[PDB]
């Protein structure tokens, strides 16, 4: 299991296209991936889960993954977030 604490810095946070890019990037991996904000942990592959988290610009979330490609999965999301979703 791999976990990372990270600040989301893009305008819309986890909303709009960035929200879709995020969901589709996690769906690329077989591992189960979660996002926690405050006290609420949701599935990173679920758009409804991400929306319910209400992640805005500047918010600090905790990404975690568990599976055969958990390291690659976390790395992929980190690189995506750090590029501010292109």
From TrEMBL:
Its main location: cytoplasm. It is found in: Cytoplasm. InterPro entries: HPr, HPr-like, HPr-like_sf, PTS_HPr_His_P_site. Transmembrane segments: none annotated. Residues 1-86 form the HPr domain. Keywords: Cytoplasm, Phosphotransferase system. One of its GO terms (cellular component) is cytoplasm. GO terms for biological process: phosphoenolpyruvate-dependent sugar phosphotransferase system. General (non sugar-specific) component of the phosphoenolpyruvate-dependent sugar phosphotransferase system (sugar PTS). This major carbohydrate active-transport system catalyzes the phosphorylation of incoming sugar substrates concomitantly with their translocation across the cell membrane. The phosphoryl group from phosphoenolpyruvate (PEP) is transferred to the phosphoryl carrier protein HPr by enzyme I. Phospho-HPr then transfers it to the PTS EIIA domain. This is Phosphocarrier protein HPr.
């Amino acid at each position: 299991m791999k976990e990372v604490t990270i600040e989301i810095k893009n305008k819309t946070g986890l909303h709009a296209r960035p929200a879709a890019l995020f969901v589709q990037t996690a769906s690329k991996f077989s591992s189960q991936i979660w996002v926690e904000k405050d006290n609420k942990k949701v599935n990173a592959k679920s758009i409804m889960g991400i929306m319910s988290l209400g992640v805005s610009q500047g918010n600090v979330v905790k990404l975690s993954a568990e599976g055969d490609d958990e390291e690659e999965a976390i790395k992929a999301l980190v690189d995506l977030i750090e590029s501010k979703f292109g």
